Amino acid sequence: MKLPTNLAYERSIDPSDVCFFVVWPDDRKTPLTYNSRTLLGQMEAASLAYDVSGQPIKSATAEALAQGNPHQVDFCHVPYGASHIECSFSVSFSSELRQPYKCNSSKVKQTLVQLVELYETKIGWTELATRYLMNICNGKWLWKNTRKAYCWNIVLTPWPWNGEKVGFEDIRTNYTSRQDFKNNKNWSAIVEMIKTAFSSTDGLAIFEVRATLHLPTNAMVRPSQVFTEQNSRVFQSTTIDGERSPILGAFKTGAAIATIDDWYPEATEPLRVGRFGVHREDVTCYRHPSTGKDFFSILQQAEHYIEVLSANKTPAQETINDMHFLMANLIKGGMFQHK
Amino acid sequence: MKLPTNLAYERSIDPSDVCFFVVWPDDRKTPLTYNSRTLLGQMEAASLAYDVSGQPIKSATAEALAQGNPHQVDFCHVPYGASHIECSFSVSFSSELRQPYKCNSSKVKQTLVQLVELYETKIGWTELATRYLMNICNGKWLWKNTRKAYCWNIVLTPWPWNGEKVGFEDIRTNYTSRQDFKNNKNWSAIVEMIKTAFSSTDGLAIFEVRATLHLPTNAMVRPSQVFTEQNSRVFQSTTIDGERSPILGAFKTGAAIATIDDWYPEATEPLRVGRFGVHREDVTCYRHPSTGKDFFSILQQAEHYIEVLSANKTPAQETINDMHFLMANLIKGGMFQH
Amino acid sequence: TTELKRAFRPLTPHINELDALTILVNLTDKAKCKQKLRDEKWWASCINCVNYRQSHNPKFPDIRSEGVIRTQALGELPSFLLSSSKIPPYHWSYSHDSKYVNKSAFLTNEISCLGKTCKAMAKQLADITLTTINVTLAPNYLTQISLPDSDTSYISLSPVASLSMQSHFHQRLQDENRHSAITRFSRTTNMGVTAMTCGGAFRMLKSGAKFSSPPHSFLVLPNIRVCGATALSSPVTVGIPSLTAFFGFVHAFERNINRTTSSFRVESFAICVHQLHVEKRGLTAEFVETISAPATRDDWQCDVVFSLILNTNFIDQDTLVTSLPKRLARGSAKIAIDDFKHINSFSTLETAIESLPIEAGRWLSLYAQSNNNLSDLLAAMTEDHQLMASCVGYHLLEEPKDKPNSLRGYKHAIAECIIGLINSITFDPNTIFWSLKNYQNYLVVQPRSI
DNA sequence: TCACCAA
């Protein structure tokens, strides 16, 4: 099955920026702030002591190496009399994977709809909607702030929802595994929102997440930081009360909800969902185009999965993990052209 | 009936841009702003891993394809401690559909003008004015903004009018169907403005529309964005006070008022009114000219549509949907040469 | 061999008589050796390229158009105006097919041009046919404008972009990142050779700095807010839209009111601009027959909020609002409903100008300083960073004739734009008011004070 | 109908 010269989806999950507040002991809330400050490190770089060949640069004497290396970073930290920190954003789940946003082949548009329709008939939205929702309900979107902290607590406010706000108190102790989320008072009701969001031709399901970080005394908080082409660490920011405050990128927050991919060969750790799924720690793609298990090698066998999903015999674990990866890209979005 | 080599009308419906504002909870109204901020995504393109024959490329190894891909986009979002967003434009209905803008043939100029006075006599402007006004009063002109929101209100302000500014509160709940717009307190005082407009030698019918969008916390907004030949998502803008503000176009708006066409042979969704009516989800032409139901194969039948409407019998749905589609393109305007 | 290619091509200035013409043979390639090869089909087809050598390119926005122009800017015009007459007329080019854009480099590279050697010359001299207008108006894509001549009877005008003004502006504006505003076009070999060399980018003249308005029988139209107009006021400059567009707005506002009161007749109109905001938006053209969009271009637009003070020969509220015209240079113009209170007339100019609200704008007064060149323009654009140049009138190219297809049954002549500099007064009442002036060879919206 | 063409 060939790929058209125009194909694209929108995404079915829509996050926003995360804003940071300082909650004082009197329960009053002030936006967080930061500052740039210069420093003076050593001159450890190994381009400054050793040449490309390996032998030492002869102009880098003992006295010269220990000279002091001045730089500049942005520095954000919790104030002294503060108590905790509020983080707050909002997600959507909005059925953009039902059909292509753009497609100029008539056969391919009819086939990709039958994948999405035979996936919910035969496999169902229970596995995906659980995997996305855990990353909201813990601090996966509070990336490094969660690490080195006493406790964090998550509070939802879903919109097509009558009463009884949803709470998750003291993660790292209470909500460790999958079953610890299922034992919640109202958990299956929220999973039924995202299942009804994806199953409906207008499913909407707005969440309103709010977190609470108890950091140590005078601790450090790490926001997202900018791309630039002399400051060496420039934070992303907005404006809340006329004072600039650090924020967690909307794109960054969507990159944390969607760390789901662990269906690759010899997989240990959940990667971010993407075409030929990369790993930014060690700079390599798992699911390489020679592996046979990236996206565009599963798209070009999309007729083969229709003879599998339509039969009464249940499909093997190789050929539903190829379908879990296939839907999780159609929720991610992107352009699927060729030539 | 053969077409002239000069035929054109002006447009009958004339929109404006859509400004976006921010309402702080102390009822302070501030115009909306945005920024350009650089991101860094993966390296998915299907050309960077595969060559033209479709065989895997040998330059992009496992390491070269996991590298980093920096790009810049304009990013508009709702401010933090805001309440809602007031989106306001204005329409007009001056009935430019009466006589042509340009025509060389005077025999042909009778035929298109005598269709309209045969149309408002036999069928009348009830049907199309029902359809256009159900794109102002709901959220078609808000485009993507209506989607992924809590609720939105619409408030009209017509010009030849006395009291009670027309309100439409909580769409997606109340105003879902055609009849629910009719069951408003003053719906037939406004359809009788568009009907008065199209049937008068100079009938005017100004509106002044104002929406109110209650979004989630800190949410995206989607304005229209530019078409040129670096920054990959450049928003359209206008200067309100001293701020840059994202707008929605004067042609992005008027395409939303004129999504009417469900008169084609296999119609499951309304389409924007135009010659050989195109769809941009799937790049196809419903009403393709080989099918023979495009707009130029209706002007050639405009003589047969004079003996149809002069018969005392009510004509069928097969041959008044051609009459409705003929009217909606003369309302849309544009050159008709061949 | 790239610097020899650009030196003969019409967007570089010009330039021991044997190296040249044996290079001029070798610019049909896509040397002295293939200079010897004499195809009889190469000699007879190279004569076709001078036959479509063109003075003013009719294909400049729209490459679908159809016509040949080898004529000169007709007449003469005063010091403060500027057309393709005042610049020496020799940068011409090829406006035909993309098949022959390299085979036109043998006889159209031009200080003058090269327009059995004797056998070729006899045919060429008879058909050289300089000063040629070959346009038929019906099956092509041309602009058309009705403008009144004398007391009554309009004249139809089809402006055509001159080539000697384009390559003039493209060369002088290289060093200026501030007064230059690039528009790019696509399918550029179908345009012509004078668009191949620049690559499609044309390097227009922008109105310098930004717009900032300081505080500042006469019927007052307040807050005429145009949403999406055009900034391409000429084929040469971008900025505030042309002043035949503000004139055609008022003479549509007059001519509507002459349905009831047949002697209305605005004499002059005062323009007060707030808030330009020029920007490159987009233009999705409509699908045209194999059914796909037409060629992709680039379009500048502006969002004017101006106010207008007329000057009438001598009326309800609801007669005015329904007889407002609804387009000011392709853009929808509107008054808000709450501003309808301010359409009342007066008798003295000092009260009519204190009458309108939102006071913080500049009245348009022409900068009547002798000029002839773009450096004459740019020198005055720095002493006043708020001075904005645009199109002020149309400089003709032939006398208006009877054609079989014309705009609304009038006499049709081909015109070219005229670029003037435009002041801004704080507030000479006559100077502020503009009117339509007819010159036996042009038509320029001047103030009364000239 | 298709072979033509650039920065």
CB contact under 8 A, C184 and B15: no
SS3 C398: coil
How far is Cα A168 from Cα A140, in angstroms, rounded to an integer? Answer: 14
CA dihedral C280, C281, C287, C292 (to 10 degrees): 60
Contact C24, C106 (CB under 8 A): yes
Alpha carbon A138 to chain centroid, angstroms: 12
How far is Cα A326 from Cα A298, in angstroms, rounded to an integer? Answer: 7
Residue type, B83: S
Given B39, B42, B216, which is nearest A208 (Cβ)? B216
Structure solved via: cryo-EM
Beta bridge pairs of residue B84: B23
Contact C395, C82 (CB under 8 A): no
Contact C168, C374 (CB under 8 A): yes
SS3 C65: coil
Q: At what angle do helices A318-332 and A126-137 cross, to 10 degrees?
A: 60
DSSP state of A316: P
The bridge status of strand C411-422 relative to strand C154-159 is parallel
How far is Cα B297 from Cα B294, in angstroms, rounded to an integer? Answer: 6
Given C185, C296, C303, which is nearest B238 (Cβ)? C303
CB contact under 8 A, B56 and A278: no
Q: How far is B302 from chain C (nearest CA, A)?
A: 22
The bridge status of strand C161-162 relative to strand C56-57 is antiparallel
Contact C390, C240 (CB under 8 A): yes
Work out the burial of residue B241: count CB atoms within 10 Å of its CB; fewer than 13 is exposed, 13-18 middle, 19 or more buried: exposed
CB contact under 8 A, B249 and C279: no
**Chain B residues 206-265 with a CB less than 8 Å from chain C:** 206, 208, 226-229, 236-239, 249-251
CB contact under 8 A, B274 and C287: yes
Query: CB of residue C441 closer than 7 A to nucleic acid strand D?
Result: no
Structure tokens at A106: 């008539």
How many CB atoms within 10 Å of residue C235? 23
Contact B69, B174 (CB under 8 A): no
Half-sphere exposure of C348 (CA within 13 A, CB side): 3
Query: CB of residue C195 closer than 7 A to nucleic acid strand D?
Result: no
How far is Cα C277 from Cα B238, in angstroms, rounded to an integer? Answer: 7
Contacts from B139-144 at CB under 8 Å and sequence distance 24+?
B139/B171, B139/B211, B140/B256, B140/B257, B140/B259, B141/B15, B141/B18, B141/B89, B141/B209, B141/B248, B141/B253, B141/B256, B141/B257, B142/B18, B142/B87, B142/B211, B142/B213, B143/B222, B143/B224, B143/B248, B143/B252, B143/B256, B144/B222
To probe the interface with B, which of C182, C303, C306 has the most B CB atoms within 10 Å? C303
How far is Cα C46 from Cα C282, in angstroms, rounded to an integer? Answer: 39
How far is Cα C427 from Cα B105, in angstroms, rounded to an integer? Answer: 51
CB contact under 8 A, B217 and A88: yes
Contact B133, B260 (CB under 8 A): no
CA distances (Å), origin A34, targets A39, A218, B214, C229, C231:
16, 13, 31, 44, 43
How far is Cα A177 from Cα A199, in angstroms, rounded to an integer? Answer: 27
Chain B residues near residue A92 by CB distance under 8 angstroms: 148, 216
Contact B89, B209 (CB under 8 A): yes
Structure tokens at C394: 């149309």
Structure tokens at A178: 């999958």
Q: What are the φ and ψ backbone dihedral angles of C366, each rounded to 5 degrees?
A: -70, 135
SS3 A44: coil
Beta bridge pairs of residue C416: C395
Contact C168, C377 (CB under 8 A): no
Query: CB of residue C99 closer than 7 A to nucleic acid strand D?
Result: yes
How many CB atoms within 10 Å of residue A18? 27
> In chain C, which residues are followed by a C-to-N distance beyond 2.5 Å, i.e. a gap?
15, 30, 110, 115, 216, 289, 314, 427
E strand or H helix at C435:
strand C434-439
How far is Cα C30 from Cα C28, in angstroms, rounded to an integer? Answer: 6
Chain B residues near residue A289 by CB distance under 8 angstroms: 49-50, 56
Helices (H), C101-144: 117-127
Structure tokens at B13: 């419906």
Tell me which residue of B260, B224, B247 sits closest to B16, measured CA to CA: B247
CA dihedral A132, A133, A136, A140 (to 10 degrees): -50
Beta bridge pairs of residue C53: C94
How far is Cα C420 from Cα C434, in angstroms, rounded to an integer? Answer: 14
How far is Cα C42 from Cα C311, in angstroms, rounded to an integer? Answer: 64
Structure tokens at C219: 């019927």
Q: How far is A3 from chain B (nearest CA, A)?
A: 10
How far is Cα B254 from Cα B257, in angstroms, rounded to an integer? Answer: 5
Structure tokens at B162: 């006395």
Query: CB of residue C307 closer than 7 A to nucleic acid strand D?
Result: no
CB contact under 8 A, B92 and C326: yes
Query: CB of residue C188 closer than 7 A to nucleic acid strand D?
Result: yes
Q: What are the φ and ψ backbone dihedral angles of C435, each rounded to 5 degrees?
A: -155, 165
- Beta-carbon contacts of residue C213 (< 8 Å; ≥ 6 apart): C273, C274, C275, C360, C361, C362
How far is Cα A164 from Cα B19, in angstroms, rounded to an integer? Answer: 38
DSSP state of C110: -
CB contact under 8 A, C228 and B250: yes
Contact A206, A158 (CB under 8 A): yes
Whether C and B touch (3+ CB pairs < 8 Å), yes or no: yes
Q: What are the φ and ψ backbone dihedral angles of C412, each rounded to 5 degrees?
A: -115, 130
Q: Which bases on strand D have an atom closer than 7 Å to a protein beta carbon?
A: 4-7
Residue type, A89: F
Contacts from A28-31 at CB under 8 Å and sequence distance 24+?
A29/A86, A30/A241, A31/A240, A31/A241, A31/A243, A31/A245
- Beta-carbon contacts of residue C431 (< 8 Å; ≥ 6 apart): C365, C425, C447, C448, C449, C450
How far is Cα A196 from Cα A216, in angstroms, rounded to an integer? Answer: 41
DSSP state of A66: S
Q: End-to-end distance of chain B based on CA atoms, in angstroms?
A: 13
CA of C14 to C1' of D4 (A): 30
- Beta-carbon contacts of residue C165 (< 8 Å; ≥ 6 apart): C83, C84, C87, C235, C236, C416
How many CB atoms within 10 Å of residue C257? 20
How far is Cα A107 from Cα A112, in angstroms, rounded to an integer? Answer: 9
| Residue whose token pair is 């590279």 | C109
How far is Cα A48 from Cα A60, in angstroms, rounded to an integer? Answer: 7
Contact B309, B118 (CB under 8 A): yes
Query: CB of residue C98 closer than 7 A to nucleic acid strand D?
Result: yes
Given C138, C280, C337, which is nearest B157 (Cβ)? C337
Contact B68, B180 (CB under 8 A): no
How far is Cα A325 from Cα A331, in angstroms, rounded to an integer? Answer: 10
How far is Cα A267 from Cα A287, in angstroms, rounded to an integer? Answer: 10
Contact C322, B204 (CB under 8 A): yes
Contact B69, B28 (CB under 8 A): no
Contact C271, C388 (CB under 8 A): no
How far is Cα B205 from Cα B209, in angstroms, rounded to an integer? Answer: 13
Query: CB of residue C101 closer than 7 A to nucleic acid strand D?
Result: yes
- Beta-carbon contacts of residue B46 (< 8 Å; ≥ 6 apart): A3, A275, A296, A336, A337, A338
**Chain C interface residues (partner B, CB cutoff 8 A):** 138-139, 184-186, 200, 225, 227-228, 259, 275, 277, 279-284, 286-287, 289, 291, 296-298, 303, 318, 321-323, 326, 331-332, 334, 336-337, 405, 407-408
Tell me which residue of B154, B20, B142, B36 sits closest to B78, measured CA to CA: B20
Query: CB of residue C197 closer than 7 A to nucleic acid strand D?
Result: yes
CB contact under 8 A, A334 and B38: no
How far is Cα C378 from Cα C381, in angstroms, rounded to an integer? Answer: 5
Tell me which residue of B171, B172, B170, B208 sits closest to B190, measured CA to CA: B208
Query: CB of residue C28 closer than 7 A to nucleic acid strand D?
Result: no
How far is Cα A310 from Cα A308, in angstroms, rounded to an integer? Answer: 6
Tell me which residue of C227, C401, C393, A13 sits closest to B237, measured CA to CA: C227
Strand nucleotide closest to residue C190 (CA to C1')? D5
CB contact under 8 A, B39 and A227: yes
Half-sphere exposure of B171 (CA within 13 A, CB side): 28
Closest residue in A to B57 (Cα–Cα):
A289
DSSP state of C60: S
Tell me which residue of C207, C182, C200, C178 sits closest to C11, measured CA to CA: C200
Structure tokens at A117: 């329709």
Residue type, C293: A
Structure tokens at C71: 């004529």
CA distances (Å), origin C125, targets B37, C48, C94:
63, 13, 19
Helices (H), C336-373: 349-353
Q: What are the φ and ψ backbone dihedral angles of C169, each rounded to 5 degrees?
A: -65, -30
Tell me which residue of B85, B182, B180 sits closest to B142, measured CA to CA: B85
Given B5, B15, B337, which is nearest C332 (Cβ)? B15
How many CB atoms within 10 Å of residue B282? 16
Residue type, B223: P
Q: Chains that contact B by 3+ CB pairs under 8 Å?
A: A, C
Closest residue in B to C404 (Cα–Cα):
B104
Query: CB of residue C221 closer than 7 A to nucleic acid strand D?
Result: no
Q: What are the φ and ψ backbone dihedral angles of A321, each rounded to 5 degrees?
A: -75, -20
Query: CB of residue C7 closer than 7 A to nucleic acid strand D?
Result: no
3-class SS string, chain B: CCCCCCEEECCCECCCCEECEEECCCCCEEECCCEEEEEEECCCCCCCCECCCCCECCCCCCCCCCCCEEEEEEECECCCCCCEECCEECCCECCCCCCCCEECCHHHHHHHHHHHHHHHHHCCCHHHHHHHHHHHCCCCCCHHHCCCCCEEEEECCCCCCCCCCCEEEEECCCCCCHHHHHCCCCCCCCHHHHHHHHCCCCCCCCCCEEEEEECCCCCECCCCECCCCCECCCECEEEECCEEEECECHHHHHHHHCEEECCCCCCCCCEECCCCCEECCECEECCCCCCCCCCHHHHCCCCHHHHCCCCCCCCCCCCCHHHHHHHHHHHHCEECCC
How far is Cα B308 from Cα B123, in angstroms, rounded to an integer? Answer: 12
The bridge status of strand A69-75 relative to strand A84-89 is unpaired
E strand or H helix at C44:
helix C40-51
Q: What are the φ and ψ backbone dihedral angles of C28, each rounded to 5 degrees?
A: -85, -10
- Beta-carbon contacts of residue C380 (< 8 Å; ≥ 6 apart): C367, C369, C371, C387, C421
3-class SS string, A94-147: CCCCCCCCEECCHHHHHHHHHHHHHHHHHCCCHHHHHHHHHHHHCCCCCCCCCC
- Beta-carbon contacts of residue C14 (< 8 Å; ≥ 6 apart): C7, C110, C111
Tell me which residue of C369, C365, C345, C362 sits closest to C429, measured CA to CA: C365
**Phi-psi sector, C175: left (phi>0), alpha (psi -120 to 50), beta:** alpha
Work out the burial of residue B44: count CB atoms within 10 Å of its CB; fewer than 13 is exposed, 13-18 middle, 19 or more buried: buried
SS3 C432: helix
- Beta-carbon contacts of residue C75 (< 8 Å; ≥ 6 apart): C85, C395, C396, C439, C440, C441, C442
